[PDB]
Design an enzyme around this catalytic site. Structure first.
Site, PDB file in Angstrom:
ATOM      1  N   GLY A   1       0.785  -1.218   0.000  1.00 18.89           N
ATOM      2  CA  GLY A   1       0.000   0.000   0.000  1.00 18.89           C
ATOM      3  C   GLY A   1       0.815   1.264   0.000  1.00 18.89           C
TER       4      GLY A   1
ATOM      5  N   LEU B   1      18.484   8.056  -5.064  1.00 14.76           N
ATOM      6  CA  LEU B   1      19.925   8.287  -5.082  1.00 14.76           C
ATOM      7  C   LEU B   1      20.680   7.030  -4.674  1.00 14.76           C
ATOM      8  CD1 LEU B   1      22.168  10.553  -5.380  1.00 14.76           C
ATOM      9  CD2 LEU B   1      22.103  10.658  -2.888  1.00 14.76           C
TER      10      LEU B   1
ATOM     11  N   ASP C   1      18.945   4.933  -1.766  1.00 14.09           N
ATOM     12  CA  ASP C   1      19.300   3.514  -1.743  1.00 14.09           C
ATOM     13  C   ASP C   1      20.596   3.318  -0.959  1.00 14.09           C
ATOM     14  OD1 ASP C   1      18.815   0.656  -2.910  1.00 14.09           O
ATOM     15  OD2 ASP C   1      20.913   1.093  -3.362  1.00 14.09           O
TER      16      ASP C   1
ATOM     17  N   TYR D   1      27.979  -0.876   2.048  1.00  9.80           N
ATOM     18  CA  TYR D   1      28.581   0.308   1.464  1.00  9.80           C
ATOM     19  C   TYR D   1      29.402   1.072   2.508  1.00  9.80           C
ATOM     20  CZ  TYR D   1      25.131  -0.666  -2.214  1.00  9.80           C
ATOM     21  OH  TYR D   1      24.307  -1.208  -3.187  1.00  9.80           O
TER      22      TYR D   1
ATOM     23  N   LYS E   1      19.812  -2.864   2.716  1.00 10.15           N
ATOM     24  CA  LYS E   1      19.909  -4.252   2.272  1.00 10.15           C
ATOM     25  C   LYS E   1      20.688  -5.089   3.290  1.00 10.15           C
ATOM     26  CE  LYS E   1      20.511  -2.264  -2.430  1.00 10.15           C
ATOM     27  NZ  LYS E   1      21.464  -1.190  -1.997  1.00 10.15           N
TER      28      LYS E   1
ATOM     29  N   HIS F   1      20.221  -8.533  -0.020  1.00 15.06           N
ATOM     30  CA  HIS F   1      21.060  -7.890  -1.038  1.00 15.06           C
ATOM     31  C   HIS F   1      21.426  -8.764  -2.231  1.00 15.06           C
ATOM     32  CE1 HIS F   1      24.242  -4.436  -1.167  1.00 15.06           C
ATOM     33  NE2 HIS F   1      23.941  -4.826  -2.391  1.00 15.06           N
TER      34      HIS F   1
END
Ligand SMILES: NC(=O)c1ccc[n+]([C@@H]2O[C@H](COP(=O)([O-])OP(=O)(O)OC[C@H]3O[C@@H](n4cnc5c(N)ncnc54)[C@H](OP(=O)(O)O)[C@@H]3O)[C@@H](O)[C@H]2O)c1
Ligand SMILES: O=C(O)CN1C(=O)C[C@@H](c2ccccc2)Sc2ccccc21
Ligand SMILES: O=C(O)CN1C(=O)C[C@@H](c2ccccc2)Sc2ccccc21
EC number: 1.1.1.21
Length: 316
Positions: A10, A18, A44, A49, A78, A111
Site C-alpha cells: 500500500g 539516489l 538507496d 557500502y 539491504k 542484497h
C-alpha cells in the site's frame, strides 16, 4: 510522469532514487543533503557500502532544518550476504537502523541470494578464489525478513539480484506471510532484462534498476569494457532532446515503469540527474535503446559462480 509507484504493501515508492555505492564517507553526507534539497526522496543504502552513518547524518540534518519530514522519505537498505542466518537478520537490520538514525526502513532487501560464511569479513574467499558460503537458504532468510515487518522495523521487504526461479521459490513458499515488494536488479541499455522484468511485473513485484549509467566507477572496470555514458549512439539521442546522456539513461527505465537509482556524489550531477521529468523518450528512442542489449553485467559476482544460489546461471 507520476513520481511514485504503488507497492504491494500500500505504500508509494519514488521512482527516482539516489544510489550510494562507492560514495565515500567523506562526501556522501553532502551528496544526500543536496539530493534532498533538489527533490530526491528515495535513498538507496546498504550496510556493505559502509557509509550509512554518513547518510544518516545528512537525513537527520535535513529533518532538523525542516526541509523534509520522515514520512516523505523512502529509505532503502539491504541485508548483506554474511547475515543470512535467521539469528543474525534482526541484528543486521537494527545496525543499519542505528547507523541511519532511523526507527524504520521503508524497504529492506536481501542484497544477494547468496549467503556467505558469517564473520567480520564481508567477502570471505578461499584458496581457489571462491567465496566461502554459509549454510543458509532463501526461504529461511525470507522468513527472517518477514519478522522484521511483523516487528515494525521495516514497512516492506524485497530481494535483489534474484533470478525468476529464485523469486518463484519465495512466491510459492508454504506459509508465506509477505510477498516481496521489489526486486532490485541491474538494468540498462546493455542489459535490458526483458524477461525478468516481464516476470516480476506480471507477479506484481516492482523492479528497481541499478547501475543505470553502467557504473563507470566500478572497481573492476577494464579499459576495453563497453561504456554507456560514452556511447555515441546514446549521446545522439540525448543531443536530439537537448539533455545529457545520463538523463537519457535515467529516463529510459522510468518509461518502462521501473524505479531507477543513479549514484553521484557530485552536487552538479545530483541536480542534473533529477531533471528528467521534463521530457519524454520517443517510441523510436525506447526501441533503439532496448536494441543495444548485450547481456553485459557490471555486477556478475564472478567470485561466487560456484555458490549454490548464484543467480546468473539461469537465462533470467
Ligand atoms: N543491489 C545491488 O547489488 C546493487 C549493485 C550495484 C549498484 N546498486 C545501487 O545502484 C546505484 C547506482 O549504481 P552504481 O553506483 O553501480 O552506478 P551508476 O549510478 O550507473 O554510475 C555511477 C557513476 O556515474 C557517475 N555519474 C553520475 N551521474 C553522472 C552524470 N550526470 N554524468 C557523468 N557521470 C555521472 C558517478 O560519478 P560521481 O559520483 O563521481 O559524480 C559514478 O562514477 C548504487 O550506488 C547502489 O545504490 C545496487
Ligand atoms: O568479480 C566480480 O564480479 C567482483 N569481484 C568480487 O566478486 C571479488 C571481490 C573480492 C575481492 C577481494 C577479497 C574478497 C572479495 S570484490 C572484487 C574486487 C575487485 C575485482 C572484482 C571483485
Ligand atoms: O553489492 C553491491 O551493491 C555492490 N558491491 C558491494 O557493495 C560489495 C563490495 C565489496 C566487496 C568486497 C569487500 C567489501 C565490499 S564490491 C561488490 C563486489 C561484488 C558484488 C557486489 C559488490
Amino acid at each position: 510522469m507520476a513520481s511514485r509507484i504503488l507497492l504491494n504493501n500500500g505504500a508509494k515508492m519514488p521512482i527516482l532514487g539516489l544510489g550510494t555505492w562507492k560514495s565515500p564517507p567523506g562526501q556522501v553526507t553532502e551528496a544526500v543533503k543536496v539530493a534532498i534539497d533538489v527533490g530526491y526522496r528515495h535513498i538507496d543504502c546498504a550496510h556493505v557500502y559502509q557509509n550509512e552513518n554518513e547518510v544518516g547524518v545528512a537525513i537527520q540534518e535535513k529533518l532538523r532544518e525542516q526541509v523534509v519530514k520522515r514520512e516523505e522519505l523512502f529509505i532503502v537498505s539491504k541485508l548483506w550476504c554474511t547475515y543470512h542466518e535467521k539469528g543474525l537478520v534482526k541484528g543486521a537490520c537494527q545496525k543499519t537502523l542505528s547507523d541511519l538514525k532511523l526507527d524504520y526502513l521503508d524497504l529492506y532487501l536481501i542484497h544477494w541470494p547468496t549467503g556467505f560464511k558469517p564473520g567480520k569479513e564481508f567477502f570471505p574467499l578461499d584458496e581457489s578464489g571462491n567465496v566461502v558460503p554459509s549454510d543458509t537458504n532463501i526461504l529461511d532468510t525470507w522468513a527472517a525478513m518477514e519478522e522484521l515487518v511483523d516487528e515494525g522495523l521495516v514497512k516492506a521487504i524485497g530481494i535483489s539480484n534474484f533470478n525468476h526461479l529464485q523469486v518463484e521459490m519465495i512466491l510459492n513458499k508454504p506459509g508465506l506471510k509477505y510477498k516481496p515488494a521489489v526486486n532490485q536488479i541491474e538494468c540498462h541499455p546493455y542489459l535490458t532484462q526483458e524477461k525478468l522484468i516481464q516476470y516480476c511485473q506480471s507477479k506484481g513485484i516492482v523492479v528497481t534498476a541499478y547501475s543505470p549509467l553502467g557504473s563507470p566507477d566500478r572497481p573492476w572496470a577494464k579499459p576495453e569494457d563497453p561504456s554507456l555514458l560514452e556511447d555515441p549512439r546514446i549521446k545522439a539521442i540525448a543531443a536530439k532532446h537537448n539533455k545529457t546522456t545520463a538523463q537519457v539513461l535515467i529516463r529510459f527505465p522510468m518509461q518502462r515503469n521501473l524505479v531507477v537509482i543513479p549514484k553521484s556524489v557530485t552536487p552538479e550531477r545530483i541536480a542534473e540527474n533529477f531533471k528528467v521529468f521534463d521530457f519524454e523518450l520517443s517510441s523510436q528512442d525506447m526501441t533503439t535503446l532496448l536494441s543495444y542489449n548485450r547481456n553485459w553485467r557490471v555486477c556478475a559476482l564472478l567470485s561466487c559462480t560456484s555458490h549454490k544460489d548464484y543467480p546468473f546461471h539461469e537465462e533470467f
